[PDB]
């Protein structure tokens, strides 16, 4: 279950249509290196909720800042 989430999330990212995945990685931050403000991050989190089938609040979402943190979240 674990390492499928990695490429799953990464495919969602690639389809996000605004990140240009040539820079992209799993430890890739969103704010600093990619310059994506909070609303784009919210769109990303919705894409993850669409991939899975469980809702999640905005506090967890703002604790998340990169795909690895997302993967670490899907466990719990």
């Amino acid at each position: 279950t674990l390492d499928g989430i990695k490429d799953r999330v990464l495919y969602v990212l690639k389809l996000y249509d605004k990140i240009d995945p040539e820079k992209l990685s799993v430890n890739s931050h969103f704010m600093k290196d990619l310059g994506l403000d909070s609303l784009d991050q919210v769109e990303i989190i919705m894409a993850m909720e669409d991939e899975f089938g469980f809702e999640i609040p905005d506090i967890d979402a703002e604790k998340l800042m990169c795909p690895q943190e997302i993967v670490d979240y899907i466990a719990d």
Partner: protein
């Protein structure tokens, strides 16, 4: 300084509500283009949402932000329901108003306005 709040101890606790509202709008757009048969794509509806959000990003007073959140929830109520028609929603896009020229010389060619 030394003023009362409304729903927000600080600006971060207001941005929380802001993001909840952005979320509700993002999840509502695909249903509104479907229920009342709009002739747009979901992409540009959500781009309009982000545009009308970034129309007010300069603000820093929490109270103003809370009131804007309230009015956004009102518009979201009106749009989730069909109290408002295709006319009102497509009013946002300005599909008939020619672009106000943001250049000096054009304004000089037409009008005395600045």
């Amino acid at each position: 300084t030394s003023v009362k709040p409304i729903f927000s101890r600080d600006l971060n606790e207001a941005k929380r509500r802001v993001r909840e509202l952005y979320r509700a709008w993002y999840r509502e757009v695909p249903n509104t283009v479907h229920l009342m048969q709009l002739d747009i794509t979901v992409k540009q509806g959500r781009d309009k949402v982000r545009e009308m959000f970034m129309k007010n990003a300069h603000v820093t007073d929490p109270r103003v932000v809370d009131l804007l959140v309230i009015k956004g929830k009102m518009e979201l109520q009106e749009t989730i329901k069909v109290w408002k028609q295709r006319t009102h929603v497509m009013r946002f896009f300005h599909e008939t108003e020619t672009p106000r020229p943001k250049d000096f010389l054009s304004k000089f060619y037409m009008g005395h306005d600045p």
